[PDB]
Amino acid sequence: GIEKIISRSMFDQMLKHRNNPACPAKGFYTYDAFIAAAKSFPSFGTTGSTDVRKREIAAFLGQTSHETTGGWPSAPDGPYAWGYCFLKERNPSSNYCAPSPRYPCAPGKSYYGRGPIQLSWNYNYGPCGEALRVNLLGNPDLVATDRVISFKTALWFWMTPQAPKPSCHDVITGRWQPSAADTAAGRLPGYGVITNIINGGLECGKGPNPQVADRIGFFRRYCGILGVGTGNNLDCYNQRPFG
Ligand SMILES: CC(=O)N[C@@H]1[C@@H](O)[C@H](O)[C@@H](CO)O[C@@H]1O
Ligand SMILES: CC(=O)N[C@@H]1[C@@H](O)[C@H](O)[C@@H](CO)O[C@@H]1O
Ligand SMILES: CC(=O)N[C@@H]1[C@@H](O)[C@H](O)[C@@H](CO)O[C@H]1O
Numbered sequence: 352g353i354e355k356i357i358s359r360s361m362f363d364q365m366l367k368h369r370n371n372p373a374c375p376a377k378g379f380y381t382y383d384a385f386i387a388a389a390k391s392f393p394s395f396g397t398t399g400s401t402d403v404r405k406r407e408i409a410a411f412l413g414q415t416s417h418e419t420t421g422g423w424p425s426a427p428d429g430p431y432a433w434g435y436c437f438l439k440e441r442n443p444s445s446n447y448c449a450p451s452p453r454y455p456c457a458p459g460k461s462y463y464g465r466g467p468i469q470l471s472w473n474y475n476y477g478p479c480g481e482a483l484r485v486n487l488l489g490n491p492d493l494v495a496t497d498r499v500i501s502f503k504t505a506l507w508f509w510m511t512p513q514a515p516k517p518s519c520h521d522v523i524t525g526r527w528q529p530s531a532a533d534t535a536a537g538r539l540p541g542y543g544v545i546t547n548i549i550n551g552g553l554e555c556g557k558g559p560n561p562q563v564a565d566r567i568g569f570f571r572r573y574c575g576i577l578g579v580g581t582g583n584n585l586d587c588y589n590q591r592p593f594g
Contacts, residue, residue, distance in 0.1 A: 353389050353396035357408050357577075365412060365573055367432045374421050374436035379498055380467070388502030391483075392510050398524045405577040407523045410542060413570030414519070414549055415467035415505055420565065430565065431572040438495050440464030440471070447472045454478065457489045465494035467505035468549070479507045508549075515594045516548045536591035541584025542570055547593055555587035563587060 362382045369380050389395055396408050416434025426433050443463035448456035454477025456462070464471045470479065473488060480487030483503050487493055494504050512518045521527040522544050529538055536556075538544050546566050547555045554563050567585050574581045 352386065352393070353404075353408060354386055356396055356401070356404050361576065365576060366416070366435045367428055368421065369435035371421075371436070374433075376419070376436060376438040379438055379501070380419075380435045381498060384498035384502050387499050388506055391503055392506045395506055395510060395520065398520070398526075402579050403524055405579045406574065406582070407520070409570055409573035409577050409579065409581075410519070410523045410545060411505075411509055413542070413573050414545060414566055416569040416573075417562070417566040418464065418469040418549075419467060420569075422565070429572075431568040434569060435467065438465065438501075440469055449474055451477065454488055457491075460489070460491055462491055465491065465504070466501035468508045470494055470504045470508060475508065478511075479504050482507055482511070519545045519548055522548070538587075538590050538593070539584045541582050542567065543584045543587040543590060547587045547590050551587060551590070551592035556589065556591045558588050560588065 359382045362385065366380065368374060370377055395411070396404050398404065398407070412434070416431070419435045419437045420430070420433050421436025422430030422433035424430055440463040443461070446456070446460070447462035449472055451474045454473050456473045462471055462473050462476050470476060476487040476491050476494075483500065485493060485500060487504070494501055509519045512521065517527040522540060525540065527540065529540065533539070538547060543555075546563055550562075554560050563586050570585070571581055
């Protein structure tokens with residue numbers, strides 16, 4: 352599997368501070384859990400040329416690193432060495448509950464960000480739990496409790512199209528071709544579109560944004576380590592958010 356492209360030592364170099372005693376998630380995010388989880392999504396990091404596979408791994412780790420970052424500008428090893436520091440969304444402003452016939456909010460539960468992709472909203476927890484055969488809609492805390500399930504939610508999100516959004520996977524592997532609406536809106540293949548899929552409503556199409564820049568910094572660092580180009584279209588500053 353992906354262990355051939357990303358070794359334990361490389362993962363540890365990338366996520367240099369995940370086991371820092373200063374990080375709330377210390378000990379939770381393990382290479383073994385990452386590899387185990389990836390087995391359930393066998394085309395992740397095994398699609399296309401070696402160059403593409405490395406870029407996919409860098410893109411996934413880059414985005415998830417931003418979602419979980421403990422970085423600050425003057426941090427040791429730079430802000431892009433502080434991925435995977437957090438497990439739960441810091442200071443959430445709501446329970447992330449939206450109307451959903453299929454995946455209604457479970458009374459008393461909250462769908463704030465958890466795990467590497469900071470999975471949010473009942474309408475993500477619902478179908479993710481269905482795919483993973485666990486009750487994430489009724490027990491969203493599971494994403495912050497079992498390390499393999501945690502990684503699986505992130506990979507699920509990455510691998511799953513949700514129209515009109517393609518999967519992050521299909522974008523980074525070059526399988527996704529933009530529609531006429533996409534090319535008009537400047538949603539072109541690259542890391543920027545991936546940011547848009549993940550959190551574009553809040554981060555994209557509004558000009559320069561430090562969260563978008565942070566996502567790019569991790570991706571650049573990881574592509575450097577893996578020895579691949581990042582490609583272009585890295586930001587979504589001028590991209591209309593997806594529908
Ligand atoms: C641990 C934490 O609070 N992570 C959040 C994440 O939930 C949010 O989606 C992201 C947006 O850019 O930035 C934050 O760092
Ligand atoms: C954000 C980040 O770490 N960028 C680095 C850059 O500093 C370095 O010169 C290059 C080659 O090693 O790799 C990455 O682009
Ligand atoms: C990783 C994740 O859950 N991302 C969601 C995204 O699916 C949703 O479209 C958006 C709405 O603003 O909220 C983000 O938190």
